[PDB]
Design a binder for these strands. Structure first.
Ligand SMILES: [Mg+2]
Ligand SMILES: [Mg+2]
Ligand SMILES: [Mg+2]
Ligand SMILES: [Mg+2]
Ligand SMILES: [Mg+2]
Ligand SMILES: [Mg+2]
Ligand SMILES: [Mg+2]
Ligand SMILES: [Mg+2]
Ligand SMILES: [Mg+2]
Ligand SMILES: [Mg+2]
Ligand SMILES: [Mg+2]
Ligand SMILES: [Mg+2]
Ligand SMILES: [Mg+2]
Ligand SMILES: [Mg+2]
Ligand SMILES: [Mg+2]
Ligand SMILES: [Mg+2]
Ligand SMILES: [Mg+2]
Ligand SMILES: [Mg+2]
Ligand SMILES: [Mg+2]
Ligand SMILES: [Mg+2]
Ligand SMILES: [Mg+2]
Ligand SMILES: [Mg+2]
Ligand SMILES: [Mg+2]
Ligand SMILES: [Mg+2]
Ligand SMILES: [Mg+2]
Ligand SMILES: [Mg+2]
Ligand SMILES: [Mg+2]
Ligand SMILES: [Mg+2]
Ligand SMILES: [Mg+2]
Ligand SMILES: [Zn+2]
Lengths: 140, 102, 72, 144, 55, 129, 141
RNA sequence: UUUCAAGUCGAUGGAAGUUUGAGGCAAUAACAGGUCUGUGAUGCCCUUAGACGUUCUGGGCCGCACGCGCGCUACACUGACGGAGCCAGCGAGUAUAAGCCUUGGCCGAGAGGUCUGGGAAAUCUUGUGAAACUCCGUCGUGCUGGGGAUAGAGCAUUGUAAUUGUUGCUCUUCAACGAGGAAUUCCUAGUAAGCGCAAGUCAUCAGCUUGCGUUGAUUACGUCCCUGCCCUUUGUACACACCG
C-alpha cells in the first residue's frame, strides 16, 4: 500500500488512535471535521498542534482519528496528543530525521503533553473515608 | 468426523501450570504438522470479596479484601477429533480444567 | 423587596431608552436593568431588536452573557 | 417578537376564583398562586385556551380570562386527561374532579372527618398532628 | 392437623430462607459466587477456598 | 372569578361510595365491588384469596343468621387484620387483635375498602410527662 | 467533494431539520404532544410547545444516522436525565417510552428509517439520501 | 551546599525523579478493650415439657414534650428549569428451575406491562449513549420558576401479607431555610471538592458502606505555638504499677 503510520494519544481513560496517511490534508474526529469539536471553549486545545507548526505541514497527509474512554475534556487532550504524535512519527519514517528533530522541538518548547502522555491516574479510595485521602468526620 | 477446527478452553487460578499446559500443547502441535491459533489471553477475572475484620461489632472500621484470579485461554486447532483428545491426556494437570467444544 | 422593576414598556420609557442606550460605553442585560429600571426579560428582547435595528453592535454572543456596545 | 408598547390596557391586580393575583407575573406562573393550581396544571389550561405563554396577567382581556376560568372548572370537557386531575375517582360520586381555591380545603376537610369518623389510624395521627405515613418521630418533627 | 401448621410459614426468598454452609447462621451471609457462608465462617475458610489478601 | 353561586340538594340523601349508594352497594358481590375501589385492593383480589379471608366472611354471615330481631350480630374474633372490608360484611362486629387484646369494632358503611387492622391500633399512644 | 451529516454541527442541523419537518407537515404527530412531559424525571413539559415534537424527532433521526440498530429502550436512556428527588440524591431515569416509540414509528412511515435486522431501527436507503441534503442547505450562509 | 560524609535542594534527560503513586504483610511485650447474639468453639451457673428448646398467628425492634453523633437536600443567577450536544471505569449475571442479567419489537404520560431473542458470559444485557458538564432559550433578585418537607386523591411493581403510607409514577398542597454563635472535623495532586455508576445487603426498599471512573482546584511543602505520642534527664513511700 501507500505511506501510512498509526499512533495513539492518552489522558486518563480516553485513548485516541490517530491514522496518518499520505493525501490532501484530511483531518477528521470520529468521522467529523475538527472545525466542529464540541468543547468549543477548548477548540483551541486541538488547534494548537496546527498553528504552532503551520498548516503547510498537513497538505500531503490526511489524518483520521478515533477516541474512546475517558470523559468529554479527557478525550480532547487525548486527541491533540494523537495528532502531534502522528505527525512526528510520519516524519521519522517518510521524511528526513532533520525535519522530525524540528517539529518535536517547537511542540516540546510549548507543551510537553502534545507529545508526552500525562502519567497521572486516579488514586484508589481507602476505607474509613469517602475518598482517596478524605476521611469520615470524627466526633469526641 | 475427520479433520476438525477445534477450540480448547483452559481455565485455572494459577498461570504457571496454565502456560505449561498451553506451551506443551503448542510444542506438541509444532512437531506434529498442525495449524493452530493461540494461545489467546482472555481478560483475567478478579473475584473480589470485601468483609469486615471484626467478627463482632467493635473497633475501627477495618475491612479485608480477598482476591481470586481466573485466567482463561482458548487455543484453536485444525486436526481430527481423535488426535486432539490424546493431546489433552498428555498435558493433563490437576489444577487446570479443560473443556473442548466443536 | 424594593426593586419593583418595570416589566411593561410604555411610550415615555421607550423613546427614553432609544435616547439613553446609545450614550453608554457598554450595555448588557444588567446594564439595562440597573439604569433603565426595566426587568431582565424586557431587557433581553430589547437587545435582540436594537441589534436588529442596527443601533447596537454585538461584541459577543452567548446565552448567559450578551456583550454589546454602541454602533457609532 | 420585538418590544411593544401599550397604554391603559395593563391591569396590575387580577381577581380569579375570589383570589387576588399580580398582573406583572407571567401568566403560567401567576395562576400557581391560586390554591389547587400548580405549574403543571397552569401550563395546560393556558395552552388549551390558546393563551400564549408569553403574556403577563394584565395583558389578558376578559374574554381570555373568562375562557380560562371556564376550562379549570370543566377540565375533562377540554381533553384534559383523567390522570392529570386533582381529585380522581371521587369517594362519593366516583367521577374525576379537580377542586379549586374555595372548594379544596372543604373537601380536604371532609376527607379529614371521614378519616376521623371511622377512627382509622391515619385519621387519628392526623388528629394529633403527627406524620401518618410511617415517618419516624423520635428525632424529627421537633418544632411547634 | 398439626403437620399442616408446624413449620407452615413460608421460608423462601427470605433471610431465614438461607443459612451458612458451616455455622447455620442467618446474619452476615455472603451470597456472591454462591458461597452461602457466614462472613465469619468465610474468614476461617478463605485460605482453604482460595481467597487470599493481596491488596 | 367571573361568577360564583352556592346552592345544594339531596336525592333522598343516602350514603354513597364512588357513585353507588347503600342500596346497591350491600348486595353487590365483592368480585364486582372490588372493580370500583383503589389500586391496592384491586391487586389483592387478582392475586388469589387464600382460605383465611373467605372463611371469615362465612362465619360473619352466620353470626348475623343468629339474631333475627335485627340487633347487633354478636362478635366474631380474628387475627387476620390484613382483611379488606367489603360491603357484604357491613354492620357485622368483629374482634381484631393488636398483638395482645381483641379490639371490638363495628363495621360502619364508611369503613368499606380499608384494612381491618387499621382501626385497632397496635400500640398504646405515647404520653410524656 | 461531497457533504455529509458528520460535516455540519449537530445543534444547528437539528434546528434546520426541525423546521423542514414542520413546514413539510407530513409527520404524524400524536395528540398528547401538548400535554405530556418528555420524561418521568422531568417536572415540567417542554417550553417549545408547538415545535418540541418536531425537534425531538429531528434529534432521533440525526442520532440514528451515525449508528446501527439503536432500539427504543436505548433512546429513553439517552434523553433521560437526573431526577430531582427532593432530599435523596439525584439519579438517572429513562425517558418516556411512548414519546420515543411514536417518533420512530411515525418517522418509519414518513420514509426516513426502517426496522433493521438483528433488532433496532436502521436508516433507510432514502434516509441517507435526504438527510445529507438538509446538511447542504444549512451551511450556505 | 554539607564534617566534603550520610544526605538535601536545583536544573537536563526521562513515561516514571514526593520511598515512582497506592495499598497488602508487619517485631518484643500488653488491655479485664469487644464479641459465649458467628460458630455442631468452649468451662461453669440457670432452664429443660406450663421450656428460656423449637414452631404457628399477631404485634414490636420505626413507637415521641426532648439532648447528642454519622449524613442527604438546600438556602440560588458560577442558578433553576425546557429543549439540544453526549463522554468513563470498577463489576454482576440462570435450567424442571423455583428462576439471573435482560436488549429488540409492541402497548402505556409515566411507573409499568407483554411477545420474542441473546448471554453461565472480552461473545449478550453494554460503548451499561451516567451525572455533573456544554450550546441555545424561558425566568429576572421575588420565599421567585430557589427549596420540596407535610398532606389529600388516584395509577403500577415485589411479596402469603404493604394498615404504622416497602418502593415507583400522576395531579394537587408548597413548611423551615435569606449562608448559620461558642465550638469542632477532614485534607497537600489528578489531592480537597463537587458528579454520578457498579457491587454487598436485596422478593421489594440505599439518604449506608466497599470500590470505580467524569470535571478538577486554593494554599504549605514549614514548625513545636495548641494537641497527641516517642526518646533523654529527673523524682518516687507505686510494681495488682495513679483505676497505685
Ligand atoms: Mg444522556
Ligand atoms: Mg439531556
Ligand atoms: Mg436539584
Ligand atoms: Mg510497595
Ligand atoms: Mg479484656
Ligand atoms: Mg470487658
Ligand atoms: Mg446480633
Ligand atoms: Mg412454646
Ligand atoms: Mg431461647
Ligand atoms: Mg419487631
Ligand atoms: Mg434499631
Ligand atoms: Mg409505630
Ligand atoms: Mg463511620
Ligand atoms: Mg450537604
Ligand atoms: Mg436535591
Ligand atoms: Mg437543563
Ligand atoms: Mg462491554
Ligand atoms: Mg443542565
Ligand atoms: Mg416556590
Ligand atoms: Mg423548585
Ligand atoms: Mg412534595
Ligand atoms: Mg459566608
Ligand atoms: Mg481544625
Ligand atoms: Mg482534631
Ligand atoms: Mg424494609
Ligand atoms: Mg444497590
Ligand atoms: Mg449498614
Ligand atoms: Mg509539643
Ligand atoms: Mg526508679
Ligand atoms: Zn456462619
Amino acid at each position: 500500500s501507500t505511506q501510512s503510520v498509526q499512533t495513539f494519544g492518552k489522558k486518563k481513560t480516553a485513548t485516541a488512535v490517530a491514522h496518518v496517511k499520505a493525501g490532501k490534508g484530511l483531518i477528521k474526529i470520529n468521522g467529523s471535521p475538527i472545525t466542529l469539536v464540541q468543547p468549543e471553549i477548548l477548540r483551541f486545545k486541538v488547534y494548537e498542534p496546527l498553528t504552532l507548526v503551520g498548516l503547510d505541514k498537513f497538505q500531503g497527509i490526511d489524518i483520521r482519528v478515533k477516541v474512546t474512554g475517558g470523559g468529554h475534556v479527557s478525550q480532547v487532550y487525548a486527541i491533540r496528543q494523537a495528532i502531534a504524535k502522528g505527525l512526528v512519527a510520519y516524519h521519522q519514517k517518510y521524511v528526513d530525521e532533520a525535519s522530525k528533530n524540528e517539529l518535536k522541538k517547537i511542540f516540546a518548547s510549548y507543551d510537553k503533553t502534545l507529545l508526552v502522555a500525562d502519567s497521572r491516574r486516579m488514586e484508589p479510595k481507602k476505607f474509613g473515608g469517602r475518598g482517596a485521602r478524605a476521611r469520615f468526620q470524627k466526633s469526641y | 468426523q475427520q479433520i476438525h477446527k477445534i477450540r480448547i478452553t483452559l481455565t485455572s487460578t494459577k498461570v504457571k501450570q496454565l502456560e505449561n499446559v498451553s506451551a506443551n500443547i503448542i510444542r506438541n502441535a509444532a512437531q506434529y504438522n498442525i495449524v493452530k491459533k493461540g494461545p489467546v489471553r482472555m481478560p483475567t477475572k478478579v473475584l473480589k470479596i470485601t468483609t469486615r475484620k471484626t467478627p463482632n461489632g467493635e473497633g475501627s472500621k477495618t475491612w479485608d479484601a480477598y482476591e481470586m484470579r481466573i485466567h482463561k485461554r482458548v487455543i484453536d486447532l485444525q486436526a481430527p477429533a481423535s488426535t486432539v483428545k490424546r493431546i489433552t491426556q498428555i498435558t493433563i494437570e490437576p489444577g487446570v480444567d479443560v473443556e473442548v467444544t466443536i | 423587596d424594593k426593586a419593583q422593576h418595570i416589566v411593561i414598556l410604555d411610550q415615555e420609557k421607550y423613546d427614553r431608552i432609544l435616547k439613553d442606550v446609545p450614550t453608554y460605553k457598554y450595555v448588557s442585560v444588567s446594564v439595562l436593568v440597573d439604569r433603565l429600571k426595566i426587568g431582565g426579560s424586557l431587557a433581553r428582547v430589547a437587545l435582540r431588536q436594537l441589534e436588529e435595528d442596527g443601533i447596537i453592535t454585538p461584541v459577543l454572543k452567548h446565552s448567559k452573557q450578551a456583550i454589546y456596545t454602541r454602533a457609532q | 417578537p420585538l418590544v411593544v408598547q401599550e397604554q391603559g390596557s395593563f391591569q396590575h391586580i387580577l381577581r380569579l376564583l375570589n383570589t387576588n393575583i399580580d398582573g406583572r407575573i407571567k401568566i403560567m406562573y401567576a395562576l400557581t398562586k391560586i390554591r389547587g393550581v400548580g405549574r403543571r396544571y397552569a401550563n395546560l389550561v393556558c395552552k388549551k385556551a390558546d393563551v400564549e405563554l408569553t403574556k403577563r396577567a394584565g395583558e389578558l382581556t376578559q374574554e381570555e380570562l373568562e375562557r380560562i376560568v371556564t376550562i379549570m372548572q370543566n377540565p375533562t370537557n377540554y381533553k384534559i386527561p383523567a390522570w392529570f386531575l386533582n381529585r380522581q375517582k371521587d369517594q362519593v360520586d366516583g367521577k374525576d374532579y379537580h377542586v379549586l381555591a374555595n372548594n379544596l380545603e372543604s373537601k380536604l376537610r371532609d376527607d379529614l372527618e371521614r378519616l376521623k369518623k371511622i377512627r382509622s389510624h391515619r385519621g387519628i395521627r392526623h388528629f394529633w398532628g403527627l406524620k401518618v405515613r410511617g415517618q419516624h418521630t423520635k428525632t424529627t418533627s421537633r418544632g411547634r | 392437623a398439626h403437620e399442616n401448621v408446624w413449620f407452615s410459614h413460608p421460608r423462601n426468598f427470605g433471610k431465614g430462607s438461607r443459612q451458612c454452609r458451616h455455622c447455620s447462621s442467618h446474619s452476615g451471609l455472603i451470597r456472591k459466587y454462591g458461597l452461602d457462608l457466614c462472613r465469619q465462617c468465610f474468614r476461617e475458610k478463605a485460605a482453604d477456598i482460595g481467597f487470599n489478601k493481596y491488596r | 372569578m367571573v361568577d360564583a353561586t352556592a346552592p345544594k340538594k339531596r336525592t333522598f340523601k343516602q350514603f354513597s361510595f364512588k357513585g353507588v349508594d347503600l342500596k346497591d352497594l350491600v348486595e353487590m358481590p365483592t368480585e364486582e365491588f372490588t372493580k370500583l375501589c383503589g389500586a391496592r385492593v384491586r391487586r389483592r383480589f387478582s392475586r388469589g384469596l387464600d382460605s383465611k379471608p373467605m372463611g371469615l366472611i362465612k362465619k360473619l354471615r352466620a353470626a348475623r343468621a343468629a339474631t333475627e330481631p335485627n340487633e347487633r350480630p354478636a362478635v366474631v374474633k380474628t387475627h387476620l387484620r390484613n382483611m379488606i372490608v367489603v360491603p357484604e360484611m357491613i354492620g357485622s362486629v368483629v374482634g381484631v387483635y393488636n398483638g395482645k387484646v381483641f379490639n371490638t369494632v363495628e363495621i360502619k358503611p364508611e369503613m368499606v375498602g380499608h384494612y381491618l387492622g387499621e382501626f385497632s391500633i397496635t400500640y398504646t399512644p405515647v404520653r410524656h410527662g | 467533494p461531497g457533504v455529509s451529516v458528520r460535516d455540519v454541527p449537530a445543534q444547528d442541523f437539528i434546528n434546520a431539520y426541525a423546521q423542514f419537518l414542520q413546514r413539510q407537515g407530513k409527520l404524524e404527530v400524536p395528540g398528547y404532544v401538548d400535554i405530556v412531559k418528555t420524561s418521568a424525571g422531568n417536572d415540567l413539559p417542554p417550553q417549545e410547545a408547538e415545535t418540541w415534537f418536531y425537534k425531538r424527532a429531528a434529534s432521533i433521526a440525526r442520532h440514528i444516522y451515525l449508528r446501527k440498530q439503536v432500539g427504543v429502550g436505548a433512546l429513553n436512556k439517552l434523553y433521560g436525565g437526573a431526577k430531582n428527588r427532593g432530599f435523596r440524591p439525584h439519579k438517572h431515569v429513562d425517558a418516556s417510552g411512548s414519546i420515543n416509540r411514536k417518533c420512530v414509528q411515525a418517522l418509519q412511515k414518513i420514509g426516513v428509517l426502517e426496522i433493521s435486522p438483528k433488532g433496532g431501527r436502521r436508516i433507510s436507503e432514502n434516509g441517507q439520501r435526504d438527510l445529507d441534503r438538509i446538511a447542504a442547505q444549512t451551511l450556505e450562509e
